[PDB]
Design an enzyme around this catalytic site. Sequence first.
Site, PDB file in Angstrom:
ATOM      1  N   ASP B   8       0.913  -1.118   0.000  1.00 62.50           N
ATOM      2  CA  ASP B   8       0.000   0.000   0.000  1.00 62.50           C
ATOM      3  C   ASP B   8       0.975   1.195   0.000  1.00 62.50           C
ATOM      4  OD1 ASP B   8      -2.236   1.735   0.564  1.00 62.50           O
ATOM      5  OD2 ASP B   8      -1.509   1.754   2.614  1.00 62.50           O
ATOM      6  N   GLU B  10       0.189   5.014   1.047  1.00 65.54           N
ATOM      7  CA  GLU B  10       0.110   5.938   2.181  1.00 65.54           C
ATOM      8  C   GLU B  10       0.127   5.226   3.543  1.00 65.54           C
ATOM      9  OE1 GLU B  10      -3.261   7.698  -0.213  1.00 65.54           O
ATOM     10  OE2 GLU B  10      -2.498   9.584   0.588  1.00 65.54           O
TER      11      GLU B  10
HETATM   12 MG    MG Z   1      -2.427   3.303   3.636  1.00 65.98          MG
END
Ligand code: MG
EC number: 3.1.3.3
Lengths: 206, 206
Positions: B8, B10
């Site tokens: 992922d 962020e």
């Molecule tokens: Mg994230």
Amino acid sequence: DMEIACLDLEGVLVPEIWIAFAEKTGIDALKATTRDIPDYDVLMKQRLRILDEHGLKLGDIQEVIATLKPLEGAVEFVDWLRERFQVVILSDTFYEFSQPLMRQLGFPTLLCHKLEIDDSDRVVGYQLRQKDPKRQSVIAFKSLYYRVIAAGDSYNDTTMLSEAHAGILFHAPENVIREFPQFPAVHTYEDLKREFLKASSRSLSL
Amino acid sequence: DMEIACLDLEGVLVPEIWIAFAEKTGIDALKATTRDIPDYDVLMKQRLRILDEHGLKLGDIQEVIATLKPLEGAVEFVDWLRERFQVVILSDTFYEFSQPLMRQLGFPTLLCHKLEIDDSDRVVGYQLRQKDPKRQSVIAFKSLYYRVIAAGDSYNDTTMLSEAHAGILFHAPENVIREFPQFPAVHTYEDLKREFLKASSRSLSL
Ligand SMILES: [Mg+2]
Ligand SMILES: [Mg+2]
Ligand SMILES: [Mg+2]
Ligand SMILES: [Mg+2]
């Protein structure tokens, strides 16, 4: 619409690896090609046997391959492409042979095959990931709603070029250019850049 | 033995882009996340409205995003990971908003969403690529016979973590960790490396 740019590896970004490696070792028996031995499995078993007879373990092999470099202009081209597309490399070689070269390109995502290495660092086998791997990879990206633009240099790239939304032939033999006129054929990175710009649905700058 | 590391973006490699954009520009209304507004479509319509009311065009937005940097140690972690796996980023961000940050990570393949930019460089719309985009990305790699090891930091990564062959929670909130005990949870990049080593079927070194 962001597109995925799929590039073949050997003949597009780097030299044909096995052949260059074989030449660097000076071992004539390592130089047989599919022309000498048409059955790919038979060719691979022979290569593994000769590598072992000469004591060339994976580490030795990668040491030699690390002295190879990407084709002149390839590094800048990959950087240019990554500023404009999501880049994925598709290749019919093995992770273990490509690694030293991928490092020089900034390790872009590579989907290829894999060698079987034992505990003594000996190459003891190989595994092809799946049939028609480049074409199947394009299908996977289409499953995620991506438009795909692909480039390749050989007949073994044509199923990939045909499956993509747009295909470009790069440094391809006349044998292939003539048979696949639907794919613009170029032979300089500058012209390759221009073909990616024409193929894109977005307005990109050179 | 063929593995893709899906990360992922962020919370894992870079700060939440909107929360940081708000801290930079002083526009508090832009701190809102799905925690504040559950419907990504509504939250997105609101964010675009605010940007416009503040006269922030795309070029302006990116100047700000270019001042953000990856979390301390994330670049080194990505480099470590790319020497051992094929690394693909799965994020709910948008190409145009994240580009400056992706460049610092060496532009690894990013599968996210896109914005609608008009002639006056105004962000007038957006398009979510498909539903449950991260989970579907994992399924796409599975279709190519890859084993996938994923790492995420939040509730919205759990479908991805469950679909993968191995999922790791990194920098996750205690609530998420407690509700999803099946995934090892770590908080330092060295520990994340260790979890990727445990999850891999290959003999890799730290
Ligand atoms: Mg994230
Ligand atoms: Mg080739
Ligand atoms: Mg060629
Ligand atoms: Mg977090």
